[PDB]
Design a protein around this nucleic acid. Structure first.
Ligand code: ZN
Length: 1025
DNA sequence: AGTTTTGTTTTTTTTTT
DNA sequence: AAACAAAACT
RNA sequence: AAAAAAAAA
DNA sequence: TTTTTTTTTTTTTTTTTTTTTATAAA
DNA sequence: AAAAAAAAAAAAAAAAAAA
DNA sequence: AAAA
């Protein structure tokens, strides 16, 4: 079955013919007999046909010469076989050689092209490095599977039948009781969209909307069953988008889809560590056509605008701007409340939904949309999409016969996640509204539910009544919706005053009772909150220790191993900090850093100090992750939510408020509080406050009255001013005291303020006039804000907040280090200006795109290499002399520059620079460090010199302790290797004008010095010419 | 008059369902 | 993490 | 080897 | 209830102790 | 020669007792 | 070598 191979899109001739036929198809074809839906499927057939014609022709053309020579040789060899003479064997000898020349040249090019691709990526956080740490990828092929007989089979036709029949049954059964659905939907109170909102859904599609979706499609994804890729639509969006608009407008008008929109391919993937004998162990994934995903993406974006009107904030899955940790922290706070309570009669239930996305009944889903008030053009298009979807299984690369999808949301569809949530919201609203299912009361807060997609946790009081009523309600929803739970797989914590009462409740209820812990949303919830460290963080250390112990022999430099820690370990560490930000002992961070460094330095002591790696200006932009500062950044981030004071944030309100509530709304940028007895038992919030204050005093800020203090603050409320005055000021003039104005500004700065000024209570204005015009209030409020203050006050989005705080903490907690560049300046008798030390650092960043070439320079500048001087100190044995055996003290400058065995190579390099006709002094700082004197700092040739010198550095380092000269031919070979890698990259990324500038003059010199014997032996020949 | 800093944009991988 | 463009500070 | 949201580099 | 003094913890700096056997390619 | 670890000193917060 |  055909797929477009994306490489064809690159090729300027193939591209030109497609543009010709795309225009020519449509302008020929458009006549009033076809519907536009039929005309679109006809267009796709012609395109698929033409791509086959172009691929076949191109392959035939590229081979044409070897095709000819094979014939030409074969008749001459048969002419000899009939009539033999020596010159026929001469001719055979020549042509058969040229056959070998052509065939090897093609073999080289493919090997050099793949090497070039790897050369750009090596040691970078990219798919090659990701694959290195992963296991070997298990093949799709399925040899053997079991029958429901309890029997085992290997016959291909039996296994094809048994898989297909199983999936065909799951999707088959559509409910018919529509009258009973309407009753359930009427029973409860549900939201509605207003007119203005409904006008937004039903508005006509436009071209700008389509191109915005095309531009954002992910690249390198599998195509659907018609085999066109996202890269095709991106490439021809100029010609296609006019016709795509005509298609969607015809769908709006008529409610009819093209037949291809219904098709999908199901691929089966085996589950890890699971027994392939059983069909249940595979997981399906569905591939839909890209044109159908474009339409579905349009619809999902429209409904996403409204979704916060429809869905309560107890649901956080798939919702823009919500966080999964909101439910984790709320749940831990509920468990603490129960642990503290004197009378315990409570239950916490984690509910196991079964295959929820597949089992939703489509008629109930469409009725739900009407009750929320979605109807018209938007509802008509959604109804068309569910009219007749079908799937084909693809097993062992073989396409099985299709079956209808009569239940479920479409498993690979943009629109399915939100449609599932909207249906589940009907159940969530029923549970909240039923007063005989009792929630848990936390001061002014009641908590019943938290949801994440289909995952559900429930918090109940008086369980023996309350849990029975919950099960009844779910049974009723199951009948109409199709949604189903496995009650024995569901786990609960049960709290009772004594064990007789426990035995009774357990007798009646079906659930599995958990004694220590329950896995939830990636973490462990514990029955007592005192065990959070033991169940969450002690295991996380053990997991990282064993994971790095597996990797220890991977073929990777210290540069690549640093990137492994950032790629694999850092994300799971951050996730655990963000879910459970409890006070952690210092030993946790000591074990974590020791483990991580021991891996990076391959169990030998560090070659470069962690303090130099700490900072991005040093070591050419290679940097080591600081886990203490990521921890501190995560703990402090909570203060942003306190200042925002949002009603969606109920996780923040759920902590014990025994002494005094609401204190967190007042803390940030506001008057200090007399009493310290608040927050006595706080798990999260009291520790957040202590970290916030410590950073403010490290900055020597005054945190308590600021250019960002609110009008809704203790500062104003300690004045006795009526709440109507406060709300008047916010509604008219904005929310900061600075928006009022202090001192001479007090209202005068705008006419809107003095327009407001008359409106306020006579006596309140005198109180406010006194405070705002005082000397200290003017001084404190008028100062310029720091970048730290700007983070918490200014930003409307929580996005990016850990990375923003972490970059500040790096500047604040910065520490002093030795500089290797200074030691080099002592090693030579010279002083480097601050401008030279800057050039050394910039060169170390910009000498290459490849980390392979950059690493060699970084090691040279940062004094990586061992020397006999250093080695004699370590062994404390006084032989400090040069391993090469010239009879001299082996300083690092001797090893690189001065040794008489190395000196003939560096003189060779200087002969090439004179053939380039550059006049450059013979100074060790230019090749070793990239420090040019002031005349040459700007020059146009530095790109060339950088390649010559780094090639020479490789050549010396390869024989570091060997008693022989490095040789000119080894240097030429290394330099030509780099040339080859850069050439294929320069084509692939269309940089070729730059490449020719750098290499062209150097290439001419390298070729002029070699003999044809040497060029043949080492395959040195031009790729430009 | 030039260089440096700050923010957005395009590209990778990992967390949950 | 990289690159590119705009504005302020040296 | 697909969909959604979130996070980092 | 606030003020004053002492005690405890955390962080920063200084000083001492111990090391690895060549490197790049893979 | 160079990096990391360990100990000592300094500062700030909390508690205890008296005014 | 460490991709599809
Ligand atoms: Zn020597």
């Amino acid at each position: 079955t055909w797929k477009l191979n994306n490489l064809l899109l690159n090729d300027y001739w193939v591209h030109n013919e497609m543009k010709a036929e795309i225009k020519m198809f449509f302008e020929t074809n458009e006549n009033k007999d076809t519907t536009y839906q039929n005309l679109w499927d006809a267009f796709k057939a012609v395109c698929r046909g033409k791509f086959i014609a172009l691929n076949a022709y191109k392959r035939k053309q590229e081979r044409s010469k070897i095709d000819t020579l094979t014939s030409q040789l074969k008749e001459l060899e048969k002419q000899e076989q009939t009539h033999s003479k020596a010159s026929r064997r001469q001719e055979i000898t020549k042509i058969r050689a040229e056959l070998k020349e052509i065939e090897t040249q093609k073999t080289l090019q493919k090997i050099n092209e793949s090497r070039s691709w790897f050369f750009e990526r090596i040691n970078k956080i990219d798919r090659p490095l990701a694959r290195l740490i992963k296991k070997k990828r298990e093949k799709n092929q399925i040899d053997t599977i079991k029958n429901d007989k309890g029997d085992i089979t290997t016959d291909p036709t039996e296994i094809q039948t048994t898989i297909r029949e199983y999936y065909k049954h799951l999707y088959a059964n559509k409910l018919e009781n529509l009258e009973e659905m309407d009753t359930f939907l009427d029973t409860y109170t549900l939201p509605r969209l207003n007119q203005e909102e409904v006008e937004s859904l039903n508005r006509p599609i436009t071209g700008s909307e389509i191109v915005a979706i095309i531009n954002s499609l992910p690249t390198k994804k599998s195509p659907g069953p018609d085999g066109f890729t996202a890269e095709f639509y991106q490439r021809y969006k100029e010609e296609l988008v006019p016709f795509l608009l005509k298609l969607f407008q015809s769908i709006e008008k008529e409610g009819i889809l093209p037949n291809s929109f219904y098709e999908a391919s199901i691929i089966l993937i085996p589950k890890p560590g699971r027994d392939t004998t059983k069909k249940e162990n595979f997981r399906p994934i569905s591939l839909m056509n890209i044109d159908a995903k474009i339409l579905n993406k349009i619809l999902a974006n429209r409904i996403q605008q409204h979704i916060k009107k429809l869905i309560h904030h107890d649901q956080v899955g798939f919702i823009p701007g919500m966080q999964g940790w909101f439910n984790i922290r709320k749940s831990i706070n509920v468990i603490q409340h129960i642990n503290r309570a004197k009378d315990k009669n409570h239950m916490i239930i984690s509910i196991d939904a079964e295959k929820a996305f597949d089992k939703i009944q489509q008629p109930f889903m469409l009725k739900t949309l009407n009750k929320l008030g979605i109807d018209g053009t938007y509802f008509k298009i959604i109804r068309a999409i569910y009219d007749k979807p079908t799937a084909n299984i693809i097993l062992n690369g073989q396409k099985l016969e299709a079956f209808p999808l009569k239940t479920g949301t479409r498993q690979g569809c943009p629109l399915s996640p939100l449609l599932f949530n909207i249906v589940l919201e009907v159940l969530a609203r029923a549970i909240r509204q039923e007063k005989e299912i009792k929630g848990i009361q936390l001061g002014k807060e009641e908590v019943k539910l938290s949801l994440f997609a289909d995952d559900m946790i429930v918090y109940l009081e008086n369980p023996i009544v309350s849990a029975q009523n919950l099960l009844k309600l779910i049974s009723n929803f199951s009948k109409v919706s199709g949604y189903k739970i496995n009650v024995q797989k569901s786990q609960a914590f049960l709290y009772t005053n004594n064990r007789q009462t426990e035995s009774q409740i357990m007798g009646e209820l079906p659930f599995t009772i958990a004694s220590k812990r329950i896995k939830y949303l990636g973490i462990q919830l514990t029955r007592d909150v005192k065990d959070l460290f033991k169940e969450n963080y002690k295991p996380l250390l053990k997991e990282i220790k064993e994971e790095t112990n597996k990797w220890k022999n991977i073929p990777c430099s210290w540069v690549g191993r640093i990137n492994i820690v950032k790629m694999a370990i850092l994300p799971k560490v951050i996730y655990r900090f963000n879910a459970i930000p409890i006070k952690l002992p210092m030993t946790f961070f000591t074990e974590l850093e020791k483990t991580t460094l021991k891996f990076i330095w391959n169990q030998k002591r560090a070659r470069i100090a962690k303090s130099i790696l700490s900072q991005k200006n040093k070591a050419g932009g290679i940097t080591l992750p600081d886990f203490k500062l990521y921890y501190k950044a995560t703990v402090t981030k909570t203060a942003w939510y306190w200042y925002q004071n949002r009603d969606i944030d109920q996780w923040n309100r759920t902590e014990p408020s025994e002494i005094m509530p609401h204190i967190y709304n007042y803390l940030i940028f506001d008057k200090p509080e007399k009493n310290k007895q608040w927050g006595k038992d706080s798990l999260f919030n009291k520790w957040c406050w202590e970290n916030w204050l410590a950073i403010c005093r490290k900055l020597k800020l005054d945190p308590f009255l600021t250019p960002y203090t609110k009008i809704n603050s203790r500062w104003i409320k300690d004045l006795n001013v009526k709440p109507k005055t406060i709300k008047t000021l916010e509604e008219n003039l904005g929310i900061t005291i600075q928006d009022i104005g202090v001192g001479k500004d007090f209202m005068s700065k705008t006419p809107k303020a003095m327009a407001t000024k008359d409106k306020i209570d006579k006596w309140d204005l005198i109180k406010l006039k006194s405070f705002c015009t005082a000397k200290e209030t003017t001084i404190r409020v008028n100062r310029q804000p720091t970048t730290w203050e700007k983070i918490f006050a200014t930003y409307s989005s929580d996005k990016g907040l850990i990375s923003r705080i972490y970059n500040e903490l790096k500047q604040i907690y910065k520490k002093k280090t030795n500089n290797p560049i200074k030691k080099w300046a002592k090693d030579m008798n010279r002083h480097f200006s601050k401008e030279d030390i800057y050039a050394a650092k910039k060169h170390m960043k910009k000498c290459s795109s490849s980390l392979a070439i950059r690493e060699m320079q970084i090691k040279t500048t940062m004094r990586y290499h061992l020397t006999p001087v250093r080695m004699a100190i370590i062994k404390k044995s006084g032989n400090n002399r040069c391993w090469r055996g010239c009879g001299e003290i082996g300083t690092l400058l001797h090893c690189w520059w001065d040794c008489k065995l190395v000196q003939p190579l560096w003189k060779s390099v200087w002969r090439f620079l004179r053939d380039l006709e550059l006049e450059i002094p013979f100074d060790p700082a230019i090749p070793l460090l990239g420090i040019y004197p002031n005349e040459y700092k700007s020059c146009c040739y530095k790109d060339t010199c950088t390649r010559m010198f780094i090639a020479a550095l490789f050549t010396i380092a390869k024989t570091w302790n060997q008693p022989k000269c490095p040789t000119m031919i080894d240097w030429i070979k290394k330099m030509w290797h780099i040339y080859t890698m850069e050439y294929y990259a320069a084509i692939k990324n269309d940089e070729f004008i730059s490449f020719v500038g750098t290499w062209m003059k150097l290439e001419t010199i390298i070729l002029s010095k070699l003999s044809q014997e040497q060029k043949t032996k080492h395959r040195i020949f031009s790729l430009i010419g």
